[PDB]
Coordinates of C-alpha atoms in Angstrom, one line a residue:
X1 CA -31.7 -21.0 -8.5
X2 CA -29.0 -18.6 -7.3
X3 CA -27.8 -15.0 -8.0
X4 CA -24.1 -14.1 -7.9
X5 CA -23.5 -11.0 -5.7
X6 CA -20.1 -9.4 -5.2
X7 CA -18.2 -6.6 -3.6
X8 CA -14.8 -5.1 -4.2
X9 CA -12.2 -3.0 -2.4
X10 CA -10.1 -0.6 -4.4
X11 CA -7.0 1.4 -3.5
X12 CA -7.8 5.0 -4.5
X13 CA -5.9 8.3 -4.2
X14 CA -7.5 11.8 -4.0
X15 CA -8.7 12.8 -7.5
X16 CA -6.2 10.4 -9.1
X17 CA -8.6 9.7 -11.9
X18 CA -6.2 7.4 -13.9
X19 CA -5.6 5.1 -10.9
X20 CA -9.2 5.3 -9.4
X21 CA -11.0 4.7 -12.7
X22 CA -8.6 1.9 -13.8
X23 CA -9.2 0.2 -10.5
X24 CA -12.9 0.5 -10.8
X25 CA -12.8 -0.8 -14.4
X26 CA -10.5 -3.6 -13.4
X27 CA -12.8 -4.6 -10.6
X28 CA -15.8 -4.6 -13.0
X29 CA -13.8 -6.7 -15.4
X30 CA -12.9 -9.3 -12.8
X31 CA -16.6 -9.4 -11.7
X32 CA -17.8 -9.8 -15.3
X33 CA -15.2 -12.6 -15.9
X34 CA -16.8 -14.5 -13.0
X35 CA -20.3 -13.6 -14.2
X36 CA -21.0 -11.5 -11.1
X37 CA -24.5 -10.0 -11.6
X38 CA -24.4 -7.3 -8.9
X39 CA -21.2 -5.6 -7.7
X40 CA -20.8 -3.2 -4.8
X41 CA -17.9 -0.7 -4.9
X42 CA -16.8 1.6 -2.1
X43 CA -18.0 5.0 -0.9
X44 CA -16.7 7.9 -3.0
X45 CA -14.6 5.5 -5.0
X46 CA -14.4 7.6 -8.2
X47 CA -12.8 10.6 -6.5
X48 CA -11.5 8.8 -3.4
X49 CA -12.7 9.8 0.1
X50 CA -10.0 12.1 1.3
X51 CA -10.3 14.9 -1.2
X52 CA -11.0 17.4 1.6
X53 CA -11.6 21.0 0.2
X54 CA -11.2 19.8 -3.4
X55 CA -14.9 18.8 -2.8
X56 CA -15.7 22.5 -2.5
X57 CA -14.7 23.1 -6.2
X58 CA -17.2 22.9 -9.0
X59 CA -14.8 21.1 -11.3
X60 CA -14.1 18.0 -9.2
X61 CA -17.8 17.2 -9.1
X62 CA -18.2 17.9 -12.8
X63 CA -15.2 15.6 -13.7
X64 CA -16.4 12.9 -11.3
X65 CA -19.9 12.6 -12.9
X66 CA -18.3 12.5 -16.4
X67 CA -16.3 9.5 -15.3
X68 CA -19.4 8.0 -13.7
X69 CA -21.1 7.9 -17.1
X70 CA -17.9 6.8 -18.9
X71 CA -17.5 3.9 -16.5
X72 CA -21.2 3.1 -16.9
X73 CA -20.5 2.2 -20.5
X74 CA -18.3 -0.7 -19.4
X75 CA -21.0 -2.1 -17.0
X76 CA -22.5 -4.4 -19.6
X77 CA -24.5 -7.4 -18.4
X78 CA -24.0 -6.4 -14.8
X79 CA -25.1 -4.0 -12.1
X80 CA -22.6 -1.8 -10.3
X81 CA -22.4 0.9 -7.7
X82 CA -20.1 3.9 -7.9
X83 CA -19.4 6.7 -5.4
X84 CA -19.0 10.4 -6.1
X85 CA -19.7 13.9 -4.8
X86 CA -22.6 15.6 -6.6
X87 CA -23.8 19.2 -6.6
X88 CA -27.4 20.2 -7.1
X89 CA -28.2 23.9 -7.1
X90 CA -25.1 24.8 -5.1
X91 CA -25.5 22.0 -2.5
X92 CA -23.1 19.1 -2.6
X93 CA -24.0 15.6 -1.5
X94 CA -22.1 12.4 -0.9
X95 CA -23.6 10.0 -3.5
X96 CA -23.6 6.5 -4.9
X97 CA -24.7 5.8 -8.5
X98 CA -26.3 2.5 -9.5
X99 CA -25.6 1.4 -13.1
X100 CA -27.4 -1.6 -14.7
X101 CA -26.4 -3.0 -18.1
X102 CA -24.8 0.3 -19.2
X103 CA -27.6 2.5 -18.0
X104 CA -27.6 4.8 -15.0
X105 CA -30.6 3.9 -12.9
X106 CA -30.3 6.6 -10.2
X107 CA -28.3 8.2 -7.4
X108 CA -28.6 7.6 -3.6
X109 CA -27.4 10.4 -1.3
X110 CA -25.9 9.9 2.2
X111 CA -28.3 10.6 5.0
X112 CA -26.0 10.7 8.0
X113 CA -22.8 12.7 7.8
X114 CA -19.7 11.7 9.8
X115 CA -18.6 14.9 11.6
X116 CA -17.0 13.4 14.7
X117 CA -13.4 12.5 15.5
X118 CA -11.4 12.1 12.3
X119 CA -14.4 13.1 10.1
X120 CA -15.4 16.5 8.8
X121 CA -18.0 15.6 6.2
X122 CA -20.4 18.5 7.0
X123 CA -17.7 20.9 5.7
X124 CA -18.2 19.5 2.2
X125 CA -21.5 17.7 2.1
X126 CA -25.1 18.3 3.1
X127 CA -27.2 15.4 4.6
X128 CA -30.0 14.2 2.4
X129 CA -33.5 14.1 4.0
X130 CA -34.8 10.6 4.8
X131 CA -37.6 9.2 2.6
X132 CA -37.1 12.1 0.2
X133 CA -36.8 11.5 -3.6
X134 CA -36.1 14.1 -6.3
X135 CA -34.7 14.1 -9.8
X136 CA -31.2 14.9 -11.1
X137 CA -31.1 16.2 -14.6
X138 CA -27.9 15.3 -16.5
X139 CA -27.9 16.4 -20.2
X140 CA -31.6 15.7 -20.6
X141 CA -32.5 12.6 -18.6
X142 CA -34.4 12.5 -15.3
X143 CA -32.7 10.2 -12.8
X144 CA -34.2 9.2 -9.4
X145 CA -32.1 10.9 -6.6
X146 CA -31.9 10.8 -2.9
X147 CA -33.7 8.0 -1.0
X148 CA -34.1 5.4 -3.8
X149 CA -34.9 1.7 -4.1
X150 CA -33.7 -0.1 -7.2
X151 CA -35.5 -2.7 -9.2
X152 CA -33.1 -4.8 -11.2
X153 CA -32.8 -8.2 -12.7
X154 CA -33.7 -10.5 -9.8
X155 CA -33.5 -8.1 -6.9
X156 CA -34.6 -4.9 -5.1
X157 CA -31.6 -2.9 -4.1
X158 CA -31.3 -0.4 -1.3
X159 CA -28.3 1.6 -0.1
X160 CA -26.9 2.1 3.4
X161 CA -23.9 4.4 2.8
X162 CA -21.3 3.8 5.5
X163 CA -22.4 5.6 8.7
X164 CA -26.0 5.3 7.5
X165 CA -35.0 -0.4 3.6
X166 CA -36.5 -3.4 5.3
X167 CA -40.0 -1.9 5.4
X168 CA -39.5 -1.2 1.7
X169 CA -39.0 -4.8 0.6
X170 CA -35.3 -4.7 -0.2
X171 CA -33.8 -8.1 -1.1
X172 CA -30.3 -6.6 -1.3
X173 CA -28.7 -3.8 0.8
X174 CA -25.4 -2.4 -0.5
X175 CA -23.1 -0.7 2.0
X176 CA -20.3 1.1 0.1
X177 CA -18.0 2.5 2.8
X178 CA -14.9 4.5 3.6
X179 CA -14.2 3.1 7.1
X180 CA -10.8 4.0 8.4
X181 CA -8.8 1.3 10.2
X182 CA -8.7 1.3 14.0
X183 CA -8.0 -1.5 16.5
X184 CA -10.8 -4.0 16.8
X185 CA -13.1 -2.0 14.5
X186 CA -13.4 -4.9 12.1
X187 CA -15.1 -7.0 14.8
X188 CA -17.8 -4.3 15.3
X189 CA -18.4 -4.1 11.5
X190 CA -18.8 -7.9 11.5
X191 CA -21.8 -7.7 13.9
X192 CA -23.3 -4.7 12.1
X193 CA -23.3 -6.3 8.7
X194 CA -24.6 -9.7 9.9
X195 CA -27.1 -8.1 12.2
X196 CA -28.3 -6.0 9.2
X197 CA -28.8 -9.0 7.0
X198 CA -30.7 -10.5 9.9
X199 CA -33.1 -7.7 10.9
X200 CA -33.6 -6.9 7.2
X201 CA -33.6 -10.7 6.5
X202 CA -31.9 -10.2 3.1
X203 CA -28.5 -10.2 1.5
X204 CA -26.1 -7.5 2.7
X205 CA -22.9 -6.4 1.0
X206 CA -20.2 -4.3 2.6
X207 CA -17.3 -3.0 0.5
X208 CA -14.5 -0.8 1.9
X209 CA -11.8 1.4 0.4
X210 CA -8.3 0.0 0.6
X211 CA -4.9 1.4 1.6
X212 CA -3.3 4.7 2.7
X213 CA -5.4 6.9 0.5
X214 CA -4.4 10.4 1.5
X215 CA -1.7 10.1 4.1
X216 CA -3.2 9.6 7.6
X217 CA -6.1 7.2 7.3
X218 CA -5.6 3.6 6.3
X219 CA -8.6 1.7 4.9
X220 CA -8.7 -2.1 5.5
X221 CA -10.2 -3.1 2.1
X222 CA -12.6 -5.4 3.9
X223 CA -15.5 -6.8 1.9
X224 CA -18.3 -8.8 3.6
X225 CA -21.2 -10.7 2.0
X226 CA -24.0 -11.8 4.5
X227 CA -27.3 -13.4 4.1
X228 CA -30.1 -13.6 6.7
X229 CA -27.8 -13.6 9.7
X230 CA -24.9 -15.6 8.2
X231 CA -21.6 -14.5 6.8
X232 CA -21.3 -16.0 3.3
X233 CA -18.0 -14.6 2.2
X234 CA -15.2 -12.3 3.2
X235 CA -11.9 -11.2 1.7
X236 CA -8.4 -10.8 3.2
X237 CA -8.0 -7.4 4.7
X238 CA -5.1 -4.9 4.1
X239 CA -4.1 -6.4 0.8
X240 CA -1.2 -4.9 -1.3
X241 CA -3.2 -5.3 -4.5
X242 CA -5.1 -2.4 -6.1
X243 CA -8.3 -4.5 -6.4
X244 CA -9.7 -7.2 -4.1
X245 CA -12.9 -8.9 -5.3
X246 CA -15.1 -11.5 -3.7
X247 CA -18.5 -12.9 -4.6
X248 CA -21.0 -15.6 -3.6
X249 CA -24.0 -17.3 -5.1
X250 CA -27.1 -16.5 -3.0
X251 CA -30.1 -18.9 -3.0
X252 CA -33.3 -17.9 -4.8
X253 CA -7.8 -10.0 15.9
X254 CA -5.1 -9.1 18.3
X255 CA -4.0 -5.4 18.2
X256 CA -0.3 -6.3 17.6
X257 CA -1.3 -8.3 14.5
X258 CA -3.7 -5.6 13.1
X259 CA -1.0 -3.0 13.7
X260 CA 1.5 -5.1 11.7
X261 CA -0.9 -5.4 8.8
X262 CA -2.1 -1.8 8.8
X263 CA 1.3 -0.1 9.1
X264 CA 2.9 -2.4 6.5
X265 CA 0.4 -1.3 3.9
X266 CA 0.3 2.2 5.2
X267 CA 4.1 2.7 4.7
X268 CA 4.1 1.1 1.3
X269 CA 1.3 3.4 0.0
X270 CA 2.7 6.5 1.7
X271 CA 6.1 5.8 0.2
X272 CA 5.0 5.2 -3.4
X273 CA 2.3 7.8 -3.5
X274 CA 4.7 10.5 -2.3
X275 CA 7.2 9.2 -4.8
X276 CA 9.8 8.7 -2.1
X277 CA 12.9 6.6 -2.9
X278 CA 12.8 4.7 0.3
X279 CA 13.3 5.8 3.9
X280 CA 16.1 7.2 6.0
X281 CA 16.0 6.5 9.8
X282 CA 18.3 7.5 12.6
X283 CA 18.9 4.5 14.9
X284 CA 19.6 5.2 18.5
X285 CA 19.0 1.7 19.9
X286 CA 15.8 2.9 21.4
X287 CA 12.3 1.3 21.2
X288 CA 10.8 3.9 18.9
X289 CA 13.5 3.9 16.3
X290 CA 13.6 0.1 16.4
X291 CA 9.9 -0.2 15.9
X292 CA 10.1 2.0 12.8
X293 CA 13.0 0.0 11.4
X294 CA 11.1 -3.3 11.7
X295 CA 8.0 -1.7 10.2
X296 CA 9.8 -0.8 7.0
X297 CA 11.4 -4.2 7.0
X298 CA 8.1 -5.9 7.4
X299 CA 6.4 -3.7 4.7
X300 CA 9.0 -4.8 2.2
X301 CA 8.7 -8.5 3.0
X302 CA 4.9 -8.5 3.2
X303 CA 4.6 -6.7 -0.1
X304 CA 7.3 -8.6 -2.0
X305 CA 5.5 -11.8 -0.9
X306 CA 2.0 -10.9 -2.1
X307 CA 3.0 -9.1 -5.3
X308 CA 6.2 -10.8 -6.3
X309 CA 9.5 -9.2 -7.2
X310 CA 8.6 -7.6 -10.5
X311 CA 5.2 -6.3 -9.4
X312 CA 6.3 -5.1 -6.0
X313 CA 9.4 -3.2 -7.3
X314 CA 7.4 -1.8 -10.2
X315 CA 4.7 -0.6 -7.9
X316 CA 7.4 0.9 -5.6
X317 CA 8.6 2.8 -8.7
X318 CA 12.3 1.9 -8.1
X319 CA 12.8 -1.0 -10.4
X320 CA 15.5 0.9 -12.3
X321 CA 17.5 1.0 -9.1
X322 CA 17.7 -2.8 -9.3
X323 CA 19.2 -5.3 -11.8
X324 CA 17.2 -8.6 -11.9
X325 CA 19.6 -10.4 -11.5
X326 CA 16.8 -10.9 -8.9
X327 CA 13.7 -13.1 -8.7
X328 CA 16.4 -15.8 -8.8
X329 CA 18.0 -15.3 -5.4
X330 CA 17.3 -17.5 -2.4
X331 CA 15.7 -17.9 0.0
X332 CA 13.4 -14.9 -0.7
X333 CA 15.2 -13.1 2.2
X334 CA 18.2 -12.5 0.0
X335 CA 16.3 -10.4 -2.5
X336 CA 14.5 -8.9 0.5
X337 CA 17.8 -7.8 1.9
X338 CA 19.0 -6.3 -1.3
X339 CA 15.7 -4.4 -1.5
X340 CA 15.9 -3.2 2.1
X341 CA 19.4 -1.9 1.4
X342 CA 18.0 0.4 -1.2
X343 CA 14.7 1.1 0.6
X344 CA 16.0 1.6 4.1
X345 CA 19.1 3.7 5.0
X346 CA 19.9 3.7 8.7
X347 CA 22.5 5.7 10.6
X348 CA 23.8 5.6 14.2
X349 CA 24.8 9.1 15.2
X350 CA 27.1 9.4 18.2
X351 CA 28.8 11.9 20.4
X352 CA 31.3 11.5 23.2
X353 CA 28.3 10.5 25.3
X354 CA 27.2 7.4 23.3
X355 CA 28.6 4.1 24.8
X356 CA 28.6 1.4 22.1
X357 CA 25.8 -0.3 24.1
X358 CA 23.2 1.3 21.8
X359 CA 25.6 1.1 18.9
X360 CA 25.7 -2.7 18.8
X361 CA 21.9 -2.7 19.2
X362 CA 21.5 -0.5 16.2
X363 CA 24.2 -2.2 14.1
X364 CA 22.7 -5.6 14.9
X365 CA 19.2 -4.6 13.9
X366 CA 20.3 -3.0 10.7
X367 CA 22.4 -6.0 9.6
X368 CA 19.6 -8.5 10.3
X369 CA 17.2 -6.8 7.8
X370 CA 19.7 -5.8 5.2
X371 CA 19.2 -2.1 5.7
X372 CA 22.2 0.1 4.6
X373 CA 23.9 1.1 7.9
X374 CA 26.0 4.2 8.3
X375 CA 27.9 5.6 11.3
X376 CA 29.2 9.0 12.1
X377 CA 29.8 11.5 15.0
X378 CA 28.1 14.8 15.6
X379 CA 30.1 15.6 18.7
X380 CA 32.3 18.1 16.8
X381 CA 29.2 20.1 15.5
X382 CA 27.3 19.9 18.8
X383 CA 30.4 20.9 20.9
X384 CA 31.0 23.8 18.4
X385 CA 27.4 24.9 18.7
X386 CA 27.5 24.7 22.5
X387 CA 30.9 26.6 22.6
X388 CA 29.5 29.4 20.4
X389 CA 26.5 29.8 22.7
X390 CA 28.5 29.9 25.9
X391 CA 30.6 32.5 24.3
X392 CA 27.6 34.6 23.1
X393 CA 25.9 34.5 26.5
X394 CA 29.3 35.1 28.1
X395 CA 28.9 32.2 30.6
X396 CA 29.1 28.4 30.8
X397 CA 26.2 26.1 30.2
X398 CA 25.8 23.5 32.9
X399 CA 23.4 20.7 33.9
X400 CA 22.3 23.4 36.4
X401 CA 19.4 25.4 35.1
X402 CA 20.6 24.7 31.5
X403 CA 19.5 21.1 31.6
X404 CA 16.7 21.4 29.0
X405 CA 18.9 23.4 26.6
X406 CA 21.7 20.8 26.8
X407 CA 19.3 18.0 26.3
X408 CA 17.8 19.6 23.2
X409 CA 21.1 20.3 21.4
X410 CA 21.6 16.5 21.4
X411 CA 18.6 15.9 19.0
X412 CA 18.8 19.1 17.0
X413 CA 22.5 18.6 16.3
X414 CA 21.6 15.3 14.6
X415 CA 18.9 16.8 12.4
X416 CA 20.9 18.7 9.7
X417 CA 23.0 15.7 8.5
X418 CA 20.4 13.0 8.7
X419 CA 18.3 15.3 6.5
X420 CA 21.3 15.8 4.2
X421 CA 21.5 12.0 3.8
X422 CA 17.8 12.0 3.1
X423 CA 18.0 14.7 0.4
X424 CA 20.9 12.8 -1.3
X425 CA 18.8 9.6 -1.3
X426 CA 15.6 11.5 -2.3
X427 CA 14.0 9.5 0.5
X428 CA 11.4 10.0 3.2
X429 CA 12.9 10.9 6.6
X430 CA 11.3 9.1 9.5
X431 CA 10.6 10.8 12.8
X432 CA 10.2 8.2 15.6
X433 CA 8.0 10.0 18.3
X434 CA 5.1 8.0 19.7
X435 CA 1.7 9.3 21.0
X436 CA 2.7 9.3 24.7
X437 CA 5.6 11.6 23.8
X438 CA 3.2 13.6 21.9
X439 CA 0.9 14.1 24.9
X440 CA 3.5 16.0 26.9
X441 CA 5.9 17.6 24.5
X442 CA 8.7 15.0 25.2
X443 CA 10.2 15.4 21.7
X444 CA 12.6 18.2 20.9
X445 CA 10.9 20.5 18.3
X446 CA 13.0 20.6 15.2
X447 CA 15.2 17.9 16.8
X448 CA 13.8 14.3 16.8
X449 CA 10.6 15.7 15.3
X450 CA 12.6 16.3 12.1
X451 CA 11.3 14.4 9.1
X452 CA 8.4 13.9 6.7
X453 CA 6.5 11.0 8.3
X454 CA 5.8 9.8 11.9
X455 CA 4.6 6.2 11.6
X456 CA 4.0 5.5 15.3
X457 CA 2.8 8.9 16.5
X458 CA -0.7 7.5 16.7
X459 CA 0.1 4.7 19.2
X460 CA 1.2 5.0 22.9
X461 CA 4.5 3.9 24.4
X462 CA 3.0 0.9 26.2
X463 CA 1.8 -0.4 22.9
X464 CA 5.1 0.0 21.1
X465 CA 6.5 -2.0 24.0
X466 CA 3.9 -4.8 23.6
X467 CA 4.4 -4.7 19.8
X468 CA 8.3 -4.9 19.8
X469 CA 8.1 -8.1 21.9
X470 CA 5.4 -9.5 19.5
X471 CA 7.7 -8.7 16.5
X472 CA 10.8 -10.6 17.7
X473 CA 8.4 -13.5 18.5
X474 CA 6.2 -13.9 15.4
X475 CA 8.2 -12.0 12.7
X476 CA 11.5 -13.7 13.5
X477 CA 13.0 -10.3 14.2
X478 CA 15.6 -11.5 16.7
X479 CA 17.5 -8.4 15.9
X480 CA 15.3 -6.9 18.6
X481 CA 16.7 -9.1 21.3
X482 CA 18.9 -6.4 22.9
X483 CA 15.9 -4.0 23.0
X484 CA 14.3 -6.4 25.5
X485 CA 8.9 12.6 32.2
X486 CA 6.6 9.9 30.8
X487 CA 5.5 8.7 34.2
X488 CA 6.7 5.1 34.5
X489 CA 4.3 2.2 35.0
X490 CA 1.3 2.9 32.6
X491 CA 0.0 6.0 34.3
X492 CA 0.5 8.3 31.3
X493 CA -1.6 6.2 29.0
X494 CA -4.4 5.9 31.6
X495 CA -4.5 9.7 32.1
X496 CA -4.4 10.4 28.4
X497 CA -7.3 8.0 27.7
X498 CA -9.6 9.4 30.4
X499 CA -8.7 13.0 29.5
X500 CA -8.6 12.9 25.7
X501 CA -10.8 10.0 24.6
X502 CA -13.2 10.0 27.6
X503 CA -13.2 13.8 27.7
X504 CA -13.1 13.9 31.5
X505 CA -12.1 16.9 33.6
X506 CA -8.9 16.7 35.7
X507 CA -10.9 15.9 38.9
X508 CA -12.9 13.2 37.1
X509 CA -9.7 11.6 35.8
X510 CA -8.2 11.7 39.3
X511 CA -11.4 10.3 40.9
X512 CA -11.4 7.4 38.4
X513 CA -7.7 6.6 38.9
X514 CA -8.2 6.4 42.7
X515 CA -10.8 3.7 42.4
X516 CA -8.4 1.7 40.1
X517 CA -5.1 2.1 42.1
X518 CA -2.4 1.5 43.0
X519 CA -0.9 4.9 43.8
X520 CA -1.9 7.3 46.6
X521 CA -3.9 10.5 46.3
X522 CA -0.9 12.9 46.1
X523 CA 0.9 10.7 43.6
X524 CA -2.0 10.7 41.2
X525 CA -2.7 14.4 41.9
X526 CA 0.9 15.1 40.9
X527 CA 0.7 13.2 37.6
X528 CA -2.8 14.4 36.6
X529 CA -1.7 18.1 37.1
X530 CA 1.5 17.3 35.3
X531 CA -0.3 15.8 32.3
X532 CA -2.7 18.7 31.9
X533 CA 0.0 21.3 32.4
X534 CA 2.3 19.7 29.9
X535 CA -0.6 19.1 27.5
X536 CA -1.6 22.8 27.4
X537 CA 2.0 24.0 27.1
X538 CA 2.8 21.7 24.2
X539 CA -0.3 21.9 21.9
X540 CA 1.8 24.0 19.6
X541 CA 4.2 21.1 19.0
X542 CA 1.3 18.8 18.0
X543 CA 0.3 21.4 15.5
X544 CA 3.7 20.9 13.9
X545 CA 4.2 17.1 13.9
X546 CA 4.8 15.2 10.8
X547 CA 1.9 13.3 9.2
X548 CA 1.1 10.1 11.2
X549 CA -1.1 7.0 10.8
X550 CA -4.4 6.7 12.7
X551 CA -4.4 3.3 14.6
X552 CA -6.3 3.6 17.9
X553 CA -9.8 4.7 18.9
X554 CA -8.5 8.3 18.8
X555 CA -5.4 10.3 17.9
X556 CA -4.0 13.5 19.1
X557 CA -3.3 15.3 15.8
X558 CA -5.2 18.6 15.7
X559 CA -5.6 18.2 11.9
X560 CA -7.5 15.0 12.7
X561 CA -9.1 13.6 15.9
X562 CA -8.4 16.3 18.5
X563 CA -8.7 20.0 17.8
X564 CA -7.4 21.9 20.8
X565 CA -6.4 25.6 21.4
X566 CA -2.7 26.5 21.1
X567 CA -3.2 29.3 23.6
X568 CA -5.3 28.3 26.6
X569 CA -5.9 28.5 30.4
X570 CA -3.6 25.6 31.1
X571 CA -6.5 24.1 33.1
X572 CA -5.6 26.4 36.1
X573 CA -9.1 26.3 37.7
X574 CA -9.5 22.6 37.1
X575 CA -6.2 21.8 38.7
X576 CA -6.9 24.0 41.7
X577 CA -10.2 22.0 42.0
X578 CA -8.1 18.9 42.6
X579 CA -7.1 20.6 45.8
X580 CA -10.1 22.7 46.8

């Protein structure tokens, strides 16, 4: 005697009803095909999680509930959960509907709102009082609403919505979620789901959203089924499919890897959802630009593999750009190269100061992945710009007190044309800055910050280092062989973590660094002051950076994890404290 319980991940997009509802219905159909009796779907799956202020409108909620009921009609001979925002007397709640055999049984409202870090739920939703139960009137029917337990077929269902009973006799706890990806997070979730099925001594189902839904947050599509302390089933995370279902019959890890998986799916979704015809990237032979090149390369190969030529290209919305004359080429890599040639357009921009050293490094990389490689000089334009300025200011610009200015023209002079190539291709221009550079304003505003997406702005420089080595090794990207202010030797990352993530004052950061070593007092005092000074001066730049992917246990985008004042004290008092 067993019951078949299931869960499914779906790749939604903000208010994309056609895609969102199709995915839900396809998930329900797959479940029904396998005779799944109870199916858990993700948090806010009908509308998608990242709708932001659209949740403040009356119409989004009205449209979502109409789809809830339409979907219910297809839930024949099965029980399914659906997520959607709902408004009762002006107050909006984050809810989950439970449908049983075509009939809506009730709605559970979220009790604990996520309002920390990357979350802003309180802006759109109001927490529902614990152990409270009211009625929601739709048309003319009274549905249980709030804290509700569900009696169906052969089970008593209770909900634990993401961040969110045993003493209620629940045999099955459904945990629809919208848990963004972040290093090692999956491990924690593992313990929470299993621990939940243990303390509650019942079946526990966790179903997460999948993909880059709205731009910055990537969901891992994880689905876990646990029973009384044991994991019964799990699916493969970060799939390129729109639906990932798993089920089971119930009686009576390394950062480099996760990063590879997450960014591969992240780029694919960002590219297709923004309807971009591939990417354009400026190769300088540096670590950042190389990391970005490999990422696009890996995205194409990972996707082509899981979906196949026809499905992948169709989902990429660029099939007309190909012949096919395809799905016939060997050995997979040949069709991968032809695709990368259309998907990735790279360019090495030089001046009289380049030195072929970086050229070869960029040319090699581009050739090894099949990306279209272009080469040109911007020396004439930069020299002409510089000449015009020297003339305007009636004096010569020298490395003496004009250092910064000269350094900045190098990047800004490369922006206009690389963007022109992007517009011609109708592609997405990649900016390569990383999080370390973001901490101290290292990037030239409107220079190497030019673009529409910053795929590695969420990870620090020391990580990009560790990942590039990992790539050449495991991904057979030997094109990275050559690629064998920021405070050298890991100090920047250590200060950033203690200051931003740990929220410590300058003196606290300094004190902690001293106990760890290996530099002297004045050395650390110098770098700590430098970090805070540069941080305050450059907040305005972070307010202007291109959309980036969240990857770590925090990020520095003011639209997401870290809101910080553009105009500020510069930590003057706190830095003096380091001395007095």
